[PDB]
Symmetry: C2
Subunit: 392 residues, 2 copies
């Protein structure tokens, strides 16, 4: 019962999308909280003397995949399978597909893709395409562009007459209610889930997004067809621009993301005042609080980092270090969202956040001690004033 | 609105427990998953010429505490407050109590306790007691025994003619059906939630549990009255041996805890085989799996560590390092449940830039017996069999 889409999306070339909307999944990569779900998109190109399958579905949906595929083509007539990326969320249906096809097919992948298909599935008959290589298949020119580390070294994109099959590149979370970018309302709601996808999945490799976009700018792109989320037929440059904007960490003016843990309320009281001072100074804080009642999603925290003007952390000391969920959060921010942005740290003295961040691009403006009873609130207002002046 | 208990639990001396069952908290210390909730237990000792309050309730429950306390005594007749531990889950109600008392009392605490009461609450006039010090209050001898780092430096226990008011020491999660250790089924249910409490709260300082237990070995204890969970009037030594058992990590024969992350199911396939092999060699596996559908509570994983004979880890590789949730789990295990036990590691061979899983446990007290590679198709079943055989050889 997940929703399945199968639609013809171009007449010439004759191209179908096969999309399943995973509303079963709760954690992408087994960690990122995605209550909004994610889709898996595969494509079929039907030509004279060729039927080209591009990517696939997650392995637990392999049966639904063959059933949906069978409605648009007899799998026995498939001659080529292009694998832009071998991660099983896109490639999990491949062994079932190859068995269903029941005879040899040409399988096309990057150099690293072939090694992964071999390791994962025992697949041996893989044709390796190199960067810029062109193949004539069913009378049409397929061009293959290596875009490595987006987010694995096997990642490539397939170019067909202006149509880019890009798998992860251009992906996003969320199950949109149409296939494509033909509705503004849908596009605007979708984009933050693209942001969430970029950071959680590709964030460590964001510099490769800039190189990737640069490599692709040489090509005339009419449409972008990714392996997840919306297809872009009307304005592919808008999706690419967004990828770049997230990668660079272009800030929204006024946006400050505040993240803290609060066990007894001593941190909460300092934080509540910091947040008020932010508002009172014209800022729009987005607040993530770890407490004995509430637990934010790390995927949501990460999603909010790239377009923040600045970050604020409130940190309890805990034993020899700091609070475990703050350690975890800082470590993920450093790994996936390492941006050159200003930070305030507020902390309780124990019996540190600094050394974690000190090999990052983040620059701590000041540290402020969170005290209990003798807490001088003047030093809160002072830290916020310092931030505002930095941002002027 | 929480279940409150109010009950005389001793006639001589006259002692009341005030216990509230916190069914609102979801995470203790804002991290430990506790759907079973936790209680806060304060006590009142009524003496000739004295009324001694011992510890209190969490801050968000101050009003409920006051009204509760008021039914067993007029607060203005309170002469002494003993603060065994200053953490706000037990001390939060104190300022509202002082306010209601309305006149000066003797507030008793450890050296560190006094400094913290000032830091948290601005409370300044506190009587410091030292290790083994006795004060005569209301015709009775109160003895104070410092039990440091259980789990803070301020921690002490109060000894009153064989009755031990121990706050966190001897505490547990869970909101038991009754007050004391009078029902075996209840005791048996409750004890794993004590282990859960020990590891999550005190596990980092488990060596001080041993120091503390034997420090109290010279005291005739007929009752142990903690600040969380069950009271022990029938067999306090049973609870004490449990604390000691968890701290030493005494193993339940045959018990193995298997912890893995399965990003796509290749780890899962291998781990399922390992778990089958464990079973036919007579082990009873406890299994924790991070997948795209399910996510175990870290507090549950930690609780199962002390009496495990061995651990088995199944590890995905993720960029430079390891899986975030497995990193977190490993770091909390090292921090809270660092035991000298044998470990099997199963890991995917990644293309990470050349810290490793086995590098993390390398400094710790766990002993890695072997590493086995998780391969996709072409995985040799034989390799899993010999890892489990090697484990059974170690454990007998
Ligand atoms: Cl706090
Ligand atoms: Cl962590
Ligand atoms: Cl896996």
């Amino acid at each position: 019962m997940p929703k399945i889409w199968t639609e013809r999306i171009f007449d010439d070339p004759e191209i179908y999308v096969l999309r399943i909307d995973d509303d079963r999944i709760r954690y992408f990569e087994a960690v990122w909280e995605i209550p909004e779900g994610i889709s898996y998109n595969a494509y079929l190109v039907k030509l004279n003397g060729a039927n080209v399958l591009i990517d696939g579905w997650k392995g637990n949906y392999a049966k639904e995949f063959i059933d949906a595929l069978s409605k648009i083509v007899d799998p026995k007539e498939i001659t080529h399978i292009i694998v832009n990326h071998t991660e099983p969320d896109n490639s999990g249906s491949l062994p079932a597909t190859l068995k269903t096809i029941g005879h040899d097919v040409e399988i096309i992948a990057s150099n690293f893709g072939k090694r992964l298909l071999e390791g994962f599935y025992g697949i041996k008959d893989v044709t390796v395409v190199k960067d810029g290589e062109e193949r004539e298949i069913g009378g049409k020119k397929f061009k293959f562009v290596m875009t490595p580390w987006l987010h694995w070294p096997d990642t490539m994109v397939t170019y067909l007459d202006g149509i880019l099959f890009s798998c992860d590149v251009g992906g996003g979370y969320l199950l949109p209610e149409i296939l494509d970018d033909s509705n503004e309302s849908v596009v605007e709601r979708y984009l933050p889930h693209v942001t969430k996808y970029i950071v959680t999945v590709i964030g460590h490799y964001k510099n490769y997004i800039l190189e990737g976009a640069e490599k692709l700018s040489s090509l005339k792109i009419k449409a972008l067809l990714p392996g997840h989320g919306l297809i872009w037929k009307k304005d592919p440059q808008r999706l690419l621009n967004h990828y770049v904007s997230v990668a660079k960490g272009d800030p929204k003016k006024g946006k400050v993301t505040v993240i803290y843990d609060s066990m007894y309320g001593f941190v909460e009281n300092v934080m509540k005042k910091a947040i008020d001072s932010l508002k009172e100074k014209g800022f729009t804080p987005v607040v993530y609080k770890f407490s004995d009642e509430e637990r934010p999603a790390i995927s949501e925290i990460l999603k909010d980092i790239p377009d923040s003007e600045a970050l604020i952390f409130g940190v309890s000391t805990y034993e020899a270090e700091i609070h475990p969920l703050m350690r975890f959060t800082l470590l993920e921010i450093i790994d996936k969202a390492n941006y050159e942005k200003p930070v305030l740290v507020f902390g309780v003295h124990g019996w540190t956040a600094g050394e974690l961040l000190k090999e990052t691009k983040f620059r701590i403006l000041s540290f402020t001690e969170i005290k209990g009873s003798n807490m001088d609130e003047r030093k809160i207002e002072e830290a916020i004033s310092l931030l505002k002046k930095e941002l002027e």
